[PDB]
Motif scaffolding. Structure first.
Motif, PDB file in Angstrom:
ATOM      1  N   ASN A  83       0.845  -1.198   0.000  1.00 16.16           N
ATOM      2  CA  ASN A  83       0.000   0.000   0.000  1.00 16.16           C
ATOM      3  C   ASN A  83       0.883   1.253   0.000  1.00 16.16           C
ATOM      4  OD1 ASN A  83       0.313   0.841   3.035  1.00 16.16           O
ATOM      5  ND2 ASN A  83      -0.327  -1.309   3.129  1.00 16.16           N
ATOM      6  N   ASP A  84       0.265   2.411  -0.223  1.00 17.15           N
ATOM      7  CA  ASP A  84       0.999   3.692  -0.285  1.00 17.15           C
ATOM      8  C   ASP A  84       1.342   4.328   1.078  1.00 17.15           C
ATOM      9  OD1 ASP A  84      -1.651   4.455   0.235  1.00 17.15           O
ATOM     10  OD2 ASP A  84      -1.648   6.116  -1.186  1.00 17.15           O
ATOM     11  N   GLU A  85       0.926   3.699   2.183  1.00 18.52           N
ATOM     12  CA  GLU A  85       1.227   4.177   3.544  1.00 18.52           C
ATOM     13  C   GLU A  85       2.208   3.266   4.310  1.00 18.52           C
ATOM     14  OE1 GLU A  85      -3.340   5.852   3.970  1.00 18.52           O
ATOM     15  OE2 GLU A  85      -2.286   5.404   5.833  1.00 18.52           O
ATOM     16  N   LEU A  86       3.037   2.507   3.590  1.00 21.71           N
ATOM     17  CA  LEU A  86       4.025   1.629   4.232  1.00 21.71           C
ATOM     18  C   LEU A  86       5.211   2.437   4.748  1.00 21.71           C
ATOM     19  CD1 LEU A  86       4.275  -1.431   1.790  1.00 21.71           C
ATOM     20  CD2 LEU A  86       3.277  -1.502   4.074  1.00 21.71           C
ATOM     21  N   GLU A  87       5.617   2.152   5.983  1.00 19.35           N
ATOM     22  CA  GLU A  87       6.874   2.655   6.545  1.00 19.35           C
ATOM     23  C   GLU A  87       7.986   1.710   6.068  1.00 19.35           C
ATOM     24  OE1 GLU A  87       8.701   2.263  10.347  1.00 19.35           O
ATOM     25  OE2 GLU A  87      10.037   3.526   9.148  1.00 19.35           O
ATOM     26  N   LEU A  88       9.244   2.110   6.244  1.00 20.88           N
ATOM     27  CA  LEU A  88      10.384   1.298   5.781  1.00 20.88           C
ATOM     28  C   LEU A  88      10.479  -0.065   6.480  1.00 20.88           C
ATOM     29  CD1 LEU A  88      12.930   0.919   4.027  1.00 20.88           C
ATOM     30  CD2 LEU A  88      14.203   2.251   5.710  1.00 20.88           C
ATOM     31  N   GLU A  89      10.262  -0.084   7.793  1.00 19.74           N
ATOM     32  CA  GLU A  89      10.242  -1.335   8.569  1.00 19.74           C
ATOM     33  C   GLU A  89       9.174  -2.318   8.095  1.00 19.74           C
ATOM     34  OE1 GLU A  89      12.050  -2.899  10.688  1.00 19.74           O
ATOM     35  OE2 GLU A  89      13.559  -1.348  11.000  1.00 19.74           O
ATOM     36  N   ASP A  90       8.000  -1.792   7.747  1.00 19.58           N
ATOM     37  CA  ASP A  90       6.907  -2.598   7.189  1.00 19.58           C
ATOM     38  C   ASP A  90       7.311  -3.219   5.848  1.00 19.58           C
ATOM     39  OD1 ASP A  90       5.031  -1.952   9.330  1.00 19.58           O
ATOM     40  OD2 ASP A  90       4.748   0.003   8.370  1.00 19.58           O
ATOM     41  N   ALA A  91       8.011  -2.446   5.020  1.00 17.90           N
ATOM     42  CA  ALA A  91       8.519  -2.927   3.725  1.00 17.90           C
ATOM     43  C   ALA A  91       9.614  -3.995   3.854  1.00 17.90           C
ATOM     44  CB  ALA A  91       9.026  -1.761   2.888  1.00 17.90           C
ATOM     45  N   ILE A  92      10.462  -3.875   4.877  1.00 13.74           N
ATOM     46  CA  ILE A  92      11.486  -4.892   5.172  1.00 13.74           C
ATOM     47  C   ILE A  92      10.821  -6.198   5.617  1.00 13.74           C
ATOM     48  CG2 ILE A  92      13.440  -5.536   6.674  1.00 13.74           C
ATOM     49  CD1 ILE A  92      13.952  -2.411   6.846  1.00 13.74           C
ATOM     50  N   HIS A  93       9.809  -6.075   6.475  1.00 15.31           N
ATOM     51  CA  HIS A  93       9.006  -7.211   6.934  1.00 15.31           C
ATOM     52  C   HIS A  93       8.362  -7.946   5.758  1.00 15.31           C
ATOM     53  CE1 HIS A  93       6.419  -9.585   9.596  1.00 15.31           C
ATOM     54  NE2 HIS A  93       5.374  -9.186   8.893  1.00 15.31           N
ATOM     55  N   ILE A  94       7.810  -7.189   4.809  1.00 16.12           N
ATOM     56  CA  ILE A  94       7.179  -7.761   3.608  1.00 16.12           C
ATOM     57  C   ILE A  94       8.216  -8.380   2.660  1.00 16.12           C
ATOM     58  CG2 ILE A  94       5.773  -7.266   1.542  1.00 16.12           C
ATOM     59  CD1 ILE A  94       4.501  -4.973   3.355  1.00 16.12           C
ATOM     60  N   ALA A  95       9.391  -7.767   2.567  1.00 19.38           N
ATOM     61  CA  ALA A  95      10.488  -8.311   1.759  1.00 19.38           C
ATOM     62  C   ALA A  95      10.972  -9.664   2.274  1.00 19.38           C
ATOM     63  CB  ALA A  95      11.650  -7.334   1.714  1.00 19.38           C
ATOM     64  N   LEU A  96      11.118  -9.776   3.593  1.00 19.84           N
ATOM     65  CA  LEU A  96      11.516 -11.033   4.236  1.00 19.84           C
ATOM     66  C   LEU A  96      10.457 -12.141   4.103  1.00 19.84           C
ATOM     67  CD1 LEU A  96      13.135  -9.458   7.418  1.00 19.84           C
ATOM     68  CD2 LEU A  96      14.384 -10.679   5.633  1.00 19.84           C
ATOM     69  N   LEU A  97       9.177 -11.770   4.158  1.00 19.93           N
ATOM     70  CA  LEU A  97       8.074 -12.719   3.936  1.00 19.93           C
ATOM     71  C   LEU A  97       8.042 -13.225   2.491  1.00 19.93           C
ATOM     72  CD1 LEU A  97       5.200 -10.971   5.947  1.00 19.93           C
ATOM     73  CD2 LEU A  97       5.976 -13.309   6.360  1.00 19.93           C
ATOM     74  N   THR A  98       8.134 -12.296   1.538  1.00 28.44           N
ATOM     75  CA  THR A  98       8.103 -12.613   0.101  1.00 28.44           C
ATOM     76  C   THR A  98       9.269 -13.502  -0.324  1.00 28.44           C
ATOM     77  OG1 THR A  98       7.223 -10.372  -0.251  1.00 28.44           O
ATOM     78  CG2 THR A  98       7.782 -11.635  -2.213  1.00 28.44           C
ATOM     79  N   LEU A  99      10.445 -13.223   0.227  1.00 22.89           N
ATOM     80  CA  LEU A  99      11.663 -13.953  -0.124  1.00 22.89           C
ATOM     81  C   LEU A  99      11.707 -15.367   0.476  1.00 22.89           C
ATOM     82  CD1 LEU A  99      14.246 -13.285  -1.858  1.00 22.89           C
ATOM     83  CD2 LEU A  99      15.323 -12.626   0.288  1.00 22.89           C
ATOM     84  N   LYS A 100      11.059 -15.577   1.628  1.00 21.65           N
ATOM     85  CA  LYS A 100      10.968 -16.914   2.257  1.00 21.65           C
ATOM     86  C   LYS A 100      10.293 -17.966   1.367  1.00 21.65           C
ATOM     87  CE  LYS A 100      10.366 -17.314   6.808  1.00 21.65           C
ATOM     88  NZ  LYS A 100       9.750 -17.491   8.151  1.00 21.65           N
ATOM     89  N   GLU A 101       9.340 -17.536   0.542  1.00 17.83           N
ATOM     90  CA  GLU A 101       8.609 -18.442  -0.351  1.00 17.83           C
ATOM     91  C   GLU A 101       9.533 -19.092  -1.387  1.00 17.83           C
ATOM     92  OE1 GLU A 101       5.540 -19.269   0.310  1.00 17.83           O
ATOM     93  OE2 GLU A 101       5.231 -17.703   1.811  1.00 17.83           O
ATOM     94  N   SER A 102      10.362 -18.284  -2.040  1.00 14.17           N
ATOM     95  CA  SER A 102      11.255 -18.765  -3.104  1.00 14.17           C
ATOM     96  C   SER A 102      12.510 -19.514  -2.611  1.00 14.17           C
ATOM     97  CB  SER A 102      11.665 -17.601  -4.017  1.00 14.17           C
ATOM     98  OG  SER A 102      12.180 -16.513  -3.268  1.00 14.17           O
ATOM     99  N   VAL A 103      12.907 -19.309  -1.355  1.00 13.82           N
ATOM    100  CA  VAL A 103      14.090 -19.979  -0.790  1.00 13.82           C
ATOM    101  C   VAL A 103      13.738 -21.410  -0.361  1.00 13.82           C
ATOM    102  CG1 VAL A 103      15.813 -19.938   1.094  1.00 13.82           C
ATOM    103  CG2 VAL A 103      15.214 -17.835  -0.088  1.00 13.82           C
ATOM    104  N   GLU A 104      14.557 -22.372  -0.792  1.00 10.34           N
ATOM    105  CA  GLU A 104      14.399 -23.782  -0.403  1.00 10.34           C
ATOM    106  C   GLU A 104      15.011 -24.050   0.972  1.00 10.34           C
ATOM    107  OE1 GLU A 104      12.990 -23.795  -4.131  1.00 10.34           O
ATOM    108  OE2 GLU A 104      15.162 -23.976  -4.331  1.00 10.34           O
TER     109      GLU A 104
END
Ligand SMILES: *[C@@H](CS(C)(=O)=O)[C@H](Cc1ccc(CN)cc1)NC(=O)[C@H](CO)NC(=O)[C@H](CC(C)C)NC(=O)[C@H](Cc1ccccc1)N=[N+]=[N-]
Ligand SMILES: [Mg+2]
Ligand SMILES: [Mg+2]
Ligand SMILES: [Mg+2]
Ligand SMILES: [Mg+2]
Ligand SMILES: [Mg+2]
Lengths: 204, 244, 241, 243, 228, 196, 240, 219
Positions: free
Chosen positions: G180-201
């Protein structure tokens, strides 16, 4: 045959309270012979003003060159160049011709549109930046201008007061120089208005 | 030696066509449609962005419409990277002309030089052509408002209205139908959007899949203004003509 | 299928000439190994001299690139010597231009960048070699950096290269699982050389005479190779324990 | 396939078939040898007498580089001359900058790098020669053999051409029977014998023997051709051993 | 354009019945400073030619390397390098003359005066001069720089024309050369006592004599000089 | 500048003063004019500081690249590289360099390279503006096969006199001893050498 | 040696396809997953450190590179091709910009210069295209925070968030829901770590993940680019 | 110009005056002469001012690219080499006279670089028109391994000597202290001269200047 004193001319810039001023004479000569009384030495690229003294062919060439460069800048950057940035461009461009220089004395003046800060700068023919809080001088009556500015100038002048100070600095300096004068132009520059005035001066 | 791997990009077919030019045109026919319409008081440029994703930053984006100087713009159809090489060359060429003559470059002169560069890539050097077709929209004090197009062959022509990219056949028929010479800018805006709306391969035409620009004399007295439309302004103009 | 003859992409995004250059790497049928001590970096390589008419002293795949940097090559000797001459020239120029000795990792990156160019430019073939650089860097300490025909490079705790590289690699992995550290916890280079030879013997399952091996050692301010008698001295010490 | 149509292309094995094809041109050439001795090196070569009309002694095949290095090669003779011409340039530029005559290992790598460079591009052909060369420098005697790939090593004895296997076998006997060393004058005689023995693999046309040597004591560290009394003595030694 | 720094003075020479003689002192001057006292300025090429060089010593050493390199190059692919296809005096001279004139024509001369002395294949005497300008000439006697003014007058009294060459023996010719070297030592401020001499004869070959000295020096009359 | 190099029984010693001037101002009173081009091949620098520094750096680079390929270069080889640079760039250089090195075969060797770029191998060499004043002294006092202590004294006395008369020379006397044992650096201060 | 490849190795096929560009994009597809997310007060870029061997020191191999003090880059595809683009990107930022204007280039223009280099490999004689897609995140005074993707063709696009390489189709969907357009940087890091966990074996921690941010200035300015430490990543994985 | 530097116990102290001149005229009274090369290396500048600025900026740029590639802090010897080799190639025509000072992995180092490409490696140096005045102070009072506040005072004193006794030098005193643990960029360190107070107000009142025509344009 000293390239910087064939044509004559002067430029001066000052800072005031939330404003800047830049002024120049109108003479172009060939040594003793006065040729033109319409040769302006101040140009602008958006809100950034550039004055150039010295050999008149190089004054014209450099104006054309910086117009070229600031036009391409604006197309690629999608914004007008700021005084601090333009000052660096002038320096780079002059030092590119280090061993075959343009015989000029450029002066940058303007207000940074983001910060609101008045900015002036000067250069030698080879690109060395001279930044100043107060005033920058250039041309064949630079000594005279240095003396006028050092005694007349005070900080934080209102636009109307600053106009009187810079005009008196130019006029009295020009009248002690054979190669300067023949008319004068002053630019008063505020955050979003610019006033250009032509001065009445002695025509000898 | 290396002869073995040379595609020979600058030869004729037995029928007297240039293989690589023809194949580049085939490439361009899959790019998003771009339309130029010239009115008596201005020019419209309209272009469809290639299938957008919802997470694309729409406002700080440029893909189709580029400024060449204050009086001339281009709409692109083809490889964007190829177009940017050419755009920068054109931008420089304009500034060379201004530096030399102290006058803004006449539109045709700029178009001819860009088209001459493209021609060269088809006759010598053994390189692939630029996979780009341009619509040039501009103004000068000789011919007033002008639309041109160029393609990978380096051939250029002048138009009252024209389309490049996908579905040009259908788009040109529709423009040919509703265009008339006394047309105004605001009518041309509507025609451009209506044509894209009918030729589009999408379900419905929305603000986020469009770039829009006008070149008017609708500044203050005898001077020309370029307006590259913001996202919200495209949203409003799309409502104003009743497409959404 | 001319996409297999020059370095352009195949339909599956592969560079077959790079892949085939990797296969040229094993053409000599020699295995190399590198480990780090506290104070040193040791590299060892098999030495096979099949012809009786050869002068065995001239048969080498270890090169002294600079005073501090050594390089062992896995691959044919002509490409190996091409790589060596370039590395020497590069390390000399660096010292002239920048006033300090070229670090092992910086040389590695440079040679890897050159290798990369051959994978992108058509007129130049890749060299069929893998280059292992060793030193005791004045900033990073004992260092092993390795370059291949793809233009890849990375630092190593230890490494191995050759036909039977996987056996040596797992042998080393299993030791560092046990020791729990990044290096051989040993004072003298002599014993780090002994470790290197011992773990090569275990992994390959062969015994070595003095003429079956080749040894390079990097210490602070010099890299040097060992003579047949230096290695023999080292082989005796292993046997007496 | 097609991997063998262009130089510098790797096959799926990791081989450069064009270089391997150059090796075939070398195998087709006449036999040449090199014998390393106590304080020097000896070179010999088989010269096939195609016709009565060839002037004897006057189609010289062994070539000098600088004043201390001798080169001999089997295969495409013009390719060998091109390599020696480069060797002469390399040796000249070494002596120009560094004053001292080029050391043999240094000279070996100059030829090696140059030959290797002709396996890097499809716009050149590999060299169709194997070159046996060497001489005497500050560190003593060195003998080398260089192949179309750019591969070279130091040798106790070396052989190439049509009779290489015969000559190699004969060389291996000398190395085994003389572990302390062979003298220069002995090596000249042995070189003659080996060329005569290796001639069995090329025996339709009869041949002319050519020998040269560098020896610290016998030639003062300079390359000289073996002529006259010393040549006929070496020929007679060889004639006695075939019968 | 340069200026000569370290320099050598006169080279002198003459023809005689069976061959030629050439000589030069062993000094390398650095202006008025007599800097280097062991410089050899006669450089033999094969067994039939001696090149004597005066002028700039750095440029002489360059020429020495060109000649050394010429011998190497002539030996390449040349079975008759020590016989019919050996380097002749006329070949060596023409090469140097070509170089000297090329270098003056690029305004970057080799700052020397050179005399090439030797004997040819057919027994003929060869003696010829070349300098930094590419100017060449031959004469029964030749001398460079200072020797042209003092040595030639003495040597020409032995061989005044061509017809005097068969009448001049090797003993008479060598005496004249050694005598001339004494006269030069008295009168040339940039000369030395120590010199080298080389005879190239058609019968006896090349004889190279080192560490010769000027002797029989008349100084006695000096004691009787009182004021000016 | 006053520089010299002297061969002796065990090898060779190089010597130099430490004064650099612009006219009559001493820009550096503690200059090091003895510079390493290889482990045991060193040079004494005279003439333009900028030229000699640039040459020495290029030579050091050349010899480093020589060593990488062919092992330890001879002192003659080092002198040849200096000569090649000095001779071919004679028009643009003011450099008087003495080259000195220790081989185990050849022992101590001295090569001097004056302004023209000629090369001269000598038992000992003197150079620099101060050398003029000690030609007489050095010729009278040099002997071949001196000991280390005698050669140190010969250099110390010689440069002492060169410094005394030459205004362009002075400061400390630096020396570098090149033998089979290794490389030794010596320094001698005014209060010692002035009263010799 | 004559470089006789003066002709294009990438040409149009009858269908209008540029084969070598498509094939380069296939090479990018095979490469490891990397992503980028833009917040209000910052940008995050991330990728998996796919270690070729456990003996290899993966700290030495930096997939995430600083281009300027306020601009960072990450890739998917061929590592050596990336490394030379980073070298040229850093150099062009100085030669054609900093030495002229006395300041670092804005994100969009540095991207444009990299894009140009990649286009030329797609048209010049005797070269193949680059086998990488880049994700360039940065900040500048007049444009603020921004995130760009650059493909082998030379084409570039600005993104709010995106992913490239192996699991990019799945990862882009995951980001569409969360962004969303109201994400803080910490929220974006949290989402990056969640998204990346899916593709990592395999292992998922600070030693196998590389993650950097463009954010606040870290004390003329301080640099906005910061590479997160192995510890800093592991701290956020406990609140995951 | 008076620029100077010393090697002290923990590192390097650089110093400079602030006067920029155009012949006999002072163009700038507070001009910065200590330039940034890298985070651990700074460079004082004398001689031709454009040459000084452009030479330090170029070498600072190239060292930044060098440091990004190698991933480690640059050394003073490489800064020294790059400046040196460039200046030599231009045979003195680039009139840059630098005092280069910084702190490496190998400790603190101080160089003086001249226009022709010669460098000296020294524990103290002075350059510019005021070098003799400054060098007199160093020859009087310098000793090796000084403490920080002592070395600061010595450099300041050496720049002051230049300010007062050399006409080419003037204005404020700028210092730069470099050690392993910190970098202290002190501008100004000292203001040895007060700005001269003016007794009268000579500024003209409004309307005093004679105008012909006026034009106003908004932005
Ligand atoms: C003192 C050095 S000195 C007098 O001891 O030689 C300063 C050093 C300095 C000041 C400022 C900076 C800025 N970062 C860096 C170093 N040097 C000067 O004041 C010099 C005097 O030689 N001044 C200049 O170079 C000035 C610059 C001024 C505009 C501020 N330039 C000129 O004087 C030019 C020089 C020039 C160059 C090429 C050809 C002809 C003339 N004159 N003009 N015009
Ligand atoms: Mg007037
Ligand atoms: Mg008048
Ligand atoms: Mg290739
Ligand atoms: Mg004195
Ligand atoms: Mg010079």
């Amino acid at each position: 045959s000293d390239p910087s004193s064939i044509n004559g001319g002067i430029v001066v810039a000052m800072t005031g309270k939330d404003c800047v001023a830049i002024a120049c004479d109108l003479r172009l000569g060939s040594q003793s012979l006065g040729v033109s009384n319409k040769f302006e030495k101040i140009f602008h690229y958006g809100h950034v003003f550039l004055g150039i003294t010295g050999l008149a062919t190089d004054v014209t060439t450099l104006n054309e060159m910086f117009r070229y460069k600031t036009n391409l800048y604006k197309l690629k950057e999608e914004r007008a160049i700021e005084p601090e940035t333009f000052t660096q461009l002038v320096s780079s461009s002059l030092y590119e011709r280090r061993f075959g220089p343009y015989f000029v004395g450029p002066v940058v003046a303007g207000i940074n549109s983001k910060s609101g800060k008045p900015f002036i700068a000067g250069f030698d023919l080879i690109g060395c930046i001279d930044e100043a809080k107060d005033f920058i001088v250039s041309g064949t009556a630079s000594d005279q201008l240095f003396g006028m500015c050092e005694s007349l100038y005070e900080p934080n002048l209102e636009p109307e007061d600053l106009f009187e100070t810079i005009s008196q600095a130019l006029l009295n300096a020009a009248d002690r120089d054979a190669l300067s004068g023949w008319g004068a132009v002053v630019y008063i520059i505020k955050k979003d208005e610019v006033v250009k005035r032509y001065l009445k001066m002695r025509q000898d | 030696g290396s002869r073995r791997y040379d595609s020979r990009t600058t030869i004729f077919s037995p029928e007297g066509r240039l293989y690589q030019v023809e194949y580049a045109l085939e490439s361009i026919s899959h790019a998003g449609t771009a339309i130029g319409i010239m009115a008596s008081d201005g020019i419209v440029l309209a272009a469809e962005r290639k299938v957008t994703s919802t997470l694309l930053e729409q406002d700080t984006s440029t893909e189709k419409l580029y400024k060449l100087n204050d009086k001339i713009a281009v709409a692109v159809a083809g490889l964007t990277a190829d177009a940017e090489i050419l755009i920068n060359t054109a931008r420089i060429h304009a500034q060379n002309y201004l530096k030399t003559y102290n006058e803004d470059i006449p539109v045709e002169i700029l178009v001819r030089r860009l088209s001459d560069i493209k021609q060269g890539y088809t006759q010598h050097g053994g390189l692939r052509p630029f996979g780009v077709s341009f619509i040039y929209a501009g103004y000068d004090d000789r011919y007033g408002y002008q639309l041109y197009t160029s393609n990978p062959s380096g051939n250029y022509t002048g138009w009252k209205a024209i389309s490049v990219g996908a579905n040009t056949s259908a788009a040109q028929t529709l423009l040919q139908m509703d265009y008339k010479d006394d047309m105004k800018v605001d009518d041309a805006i509507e025609l451009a959007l209506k044509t894209l709306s009918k030729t589009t391969d999408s379900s419905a035409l929305t603000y986020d899949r469009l770039e829009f620009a006008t070149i008017r004399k609708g500044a203050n007295d005898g001077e020309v203004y370029q307006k590259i439309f913001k996202p919200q302004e495209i949203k409003d103009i799309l409502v104003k003509t009743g497409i959404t | 299928g001319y996409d297999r003859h020059i370095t352009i992409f195949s339909p599956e995004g592969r560079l077959y000439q790079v892949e085939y250059a990797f296969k040229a790497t094993n053409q000599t049928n020699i295995n190399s190994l590198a480990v780090r001590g506290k104070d040193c970096t040791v590299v060892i390589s098999q030495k096979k001299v099949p012809d009786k008419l050869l002068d065995p002293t001239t048969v080498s795949y270890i090169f002294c690139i600079s005073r501090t940097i050594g390089m062992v090559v896995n691959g044919p000797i002509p490409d190996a010597r091409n790589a060596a001459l370039r590395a020497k020239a590069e390390a000399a120029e660096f010292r002239y231009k920048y006033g300090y000795d070229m670090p092992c990792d910086v040389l590695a990156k440079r040679m890897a960048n050159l290798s990369q160019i051959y994978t992108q430019r058509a007129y130049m073939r890749p060299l069929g070699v893998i280059l292992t650089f060793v030193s005791v860097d004045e900033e990073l300490g004992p260092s092993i950096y390795k370059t291949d025909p793809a233009g890849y490079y990375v630092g190593y705790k230890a490494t191995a290269t050759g036909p039977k590289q996987q056996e040596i690699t797992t042998n080393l992995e299993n030791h560092f699982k046990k020791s729990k550290i990044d290096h051989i916890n040993e004072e003298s280079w002599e014993k780090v050389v002994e470790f290197a030879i011992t773990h090569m013997i275990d992994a390959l399952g062969t015994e070595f005479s003095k003429n079956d091996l080749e040894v390079g050692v990097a210490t602070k301010d010099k890299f040097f190779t060992l003579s047949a008698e230096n290695i023999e001295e080292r082989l005796v010490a292993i046997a007496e324990q | 396939t097609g991997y063998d149509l262009s130089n510098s292309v790797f096959s799926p094995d990791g081989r450069n078939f064009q270089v391997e094809y150059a090796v075939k041109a070398v195998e087709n050439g006449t036999t040449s040898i090199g014998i390393k001795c106590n304080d020097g090196v000896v070179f010999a070569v088989e010269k096939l007498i195609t016709s009565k009309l060839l002037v004897p002694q006057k189609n010289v095949k062994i070539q000098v580089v600088d004043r201390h290095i001798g080169c001999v090669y089997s295969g495409l003779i013009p390719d060998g001359r091109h390599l020696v011409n480069r060797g002469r340039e390399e040796a000249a530029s070494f002596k120009k900058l560094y004053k001292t005559p080029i050391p043999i290992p240094a000279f070996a790598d100059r030829l090696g790098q140059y030959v290797q460079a002709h396996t890097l591009y499809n716009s050149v052909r590999p060299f169709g020669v194997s070159t046996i060369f060497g001489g005497v420098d500050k560190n003593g005697a060195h003998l080398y053999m260089l192949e179309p790939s750019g591969s070279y090593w130091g040798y106790k004895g070396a052989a190439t051409g049509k009779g290489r296997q015969s000559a190699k076998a004969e060389l291996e006997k000398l190395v085994d029977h003389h572990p302390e060393g062979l003298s220069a004058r002995e090596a000249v005689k042995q070189a003659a014998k080996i060329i005569y023995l290796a001639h069995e693999d090329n025996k339709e046309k009869d041949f002319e023997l050519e020998i040269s040597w560098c020896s610290l004591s016998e030639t003062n560290g300079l390359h000289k051709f073996v002529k006259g009394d010393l040549l006929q003595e070496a020929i007679d030694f060889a004639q006695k051993e075939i019968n | 354009t340069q200026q000569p720094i370290v320099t050598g003075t006169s080279v002198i020479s003459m023809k005689y019945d069976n061959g030629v003689i050439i000589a030069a002192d062993n000094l390398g001057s650095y202006g008025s400073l007599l800097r280097f006292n062991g410089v050899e300025r006669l450089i033999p090429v094969g067994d039939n030619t001696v090149v004597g060089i005066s002028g700039d010593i750095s440029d002489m050493q360059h020429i020495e390397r060109l000649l050394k390199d010429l011998v190497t190059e002539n030996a390449y692919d040349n079975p008759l390098a020590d016989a019919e296809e050996a380097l002749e005096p006329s070949y060596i001279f023409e090469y140097l003359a070509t170089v000297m004139y090329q270098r003056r024509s690029k305004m970057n001369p080799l700052w020397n005066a050179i005399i090439v002395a030797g004997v040819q294949s057919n027994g003929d005497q060869f003696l010829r001069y070349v300098n930094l300008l590419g100017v060449t000439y031959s004469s029964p006697t030749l001398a460079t720089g200072f020797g042209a003014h003092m040595a030639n007058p003495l040597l020409r009294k032995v061989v005044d024309r061509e017809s005097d060459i068969p009448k001049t023996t090797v003993q008479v010719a060598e005496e004249a050369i050694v005598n001339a070297m004494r006269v030069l030592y008295y009168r040339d401020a940039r000369s030395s006592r120590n010199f080298s001499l080389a005879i190239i004869d058609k019968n006896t070959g090349l004889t190279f004599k080192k560490n010769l000295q000027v002797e029989n020096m008349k100084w006695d009359f000096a004691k009787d000089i009182k004021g000016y | 500048t006053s520089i010299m190099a002297v061969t002796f029984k065990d090898g060779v010693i190089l010597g130099a003063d430490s004064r650099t001037t612009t006219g009559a101002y001493i820009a550096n009173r503690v200059t090091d004019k003895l510079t390493r081009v290889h482990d045991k091949i060193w040079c004494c620098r005279s003439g333009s500081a900028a030229d000699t520094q640039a040459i020495a750096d290029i030579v050091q680079y050349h010899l480093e690249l020589y060593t990488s390929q062919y092992g330890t270069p001879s002192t003659e080889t080092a002198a040849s590289v200096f000569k090649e640079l000095c001779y071919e760039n004679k028009d643009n250089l003011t450099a008087g360099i003495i080259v000195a090195g220790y081989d185990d075969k050849n022992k101590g060797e001295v090569y001097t390279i004056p302004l023209g770029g000629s090369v001269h191998k000598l038992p000992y060499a003197i150079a620099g503006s101060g050398s003029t004043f000690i030609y007489g002294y050095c010729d009278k006092n040099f002997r071949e096969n001196m000991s280390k202590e005698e050669t140190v004294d010969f250099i110390k006395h010689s440069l002492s006199q060169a410094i005394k008369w030459d205004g362009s020379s002075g400061g400390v006397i630096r020396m570098v001893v090149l033998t089979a044992a290794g490389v030794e650096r010596l320094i001698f201060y005014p209060d010692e050498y002035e009263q010799l | 040696m004559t470089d006789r490849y003066s002709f294009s190795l990438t040409t149009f096929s009858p269908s209008g396809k540029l084969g070598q560009i498509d094939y380069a994009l296939t090479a990018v597809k095979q490469g490891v997953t990397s992503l980028g997310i833009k917040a209000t007060n910052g940008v995050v870029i991330a990728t998996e450190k796919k270690s070729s061997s456990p003996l290899a020191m993966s700290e030495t191999l930096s997939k995430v590179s600083l281009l300027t003090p306020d601009i960072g880059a990450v890739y998917s595809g061929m590592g050596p091709d990336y490394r030379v683009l980073v070298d040229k990107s850093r150099k062009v930022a100085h030669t054609s910009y900093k030495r002229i204007y006395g300041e670092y280039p804005p994100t969009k223009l540095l991207v444009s210069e990299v894009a140009k280099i990649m286009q030329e490999a797609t048209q010049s004689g005797g070269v193949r295209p680059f086998g990488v897609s880049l994700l360039i995140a940065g900040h500048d005074e007049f444009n603020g925070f921004s995130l760009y993707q650059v493909d082998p063709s030379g084409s570039y696009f600005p993104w709010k968030a995106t992913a490239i390489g192996k699991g990019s189709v799945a990862a882009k969907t995951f980001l569409e829901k969360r962004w969303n357009d109201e994400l803080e940087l910490e929220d974006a890091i949290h989402i990056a770590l969640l998204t990346l966990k899916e593709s990592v074996e395999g292992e998922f921690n600070g030693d196998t993940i590389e993650l950097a941010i463009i954010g606040d200035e870290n004390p003329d300015k301080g640099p906005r680019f910061r590479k997160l430490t192995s510890q800093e990543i592991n701290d956020r994985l406990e609140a995951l | 110009t008076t620029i100077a530097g010393v090697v002290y116990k923990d590192g390097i102290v650089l110093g400079a005056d602030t006067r920029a001149t155009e012949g006999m005229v002072v163009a700038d009274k507070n001009c910065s002469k200590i330039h940034f090369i890298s985070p651990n290396i700074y460079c004082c500048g004398a001689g031709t001012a454009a040459d000084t600025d452009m030479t330090t900026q170029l070498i600072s740029s190239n060292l930044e690219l060098h440091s990004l590639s190698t991933g480690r802090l640059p050394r003073v010897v490489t800064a020294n080499r790059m400046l040196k080799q460039m200046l030599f190639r231009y045979q003195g025509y680039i009139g840059a006279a630098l005092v280069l000072g910084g702190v490496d992995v190998t400790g603190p180092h101080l160089y003086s670089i001249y226009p022709h490409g010669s460098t000296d490696k020294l524990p103290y140096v002075t350059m510019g028109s005021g070098s003799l005045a400054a060098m007199a102070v160093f020859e009087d009072k310098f000793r090796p391994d000084m403490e920080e506040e002592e070395a600061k005072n010595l450099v300041s004193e050496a720049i002051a000597a230049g300010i007062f006794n050399d006409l080419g030098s003037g204005g404020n005193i700028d210092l730069c202290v470099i050690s392993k643990n910190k970098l202290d960029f002190l501008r100004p360190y000292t203001v040895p001269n007060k700005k001269g107070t003016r007794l009268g107000r000579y500024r003209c009142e409004k309307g005093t200047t004679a105008v012909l025509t006026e034009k106003i344009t908004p932005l």
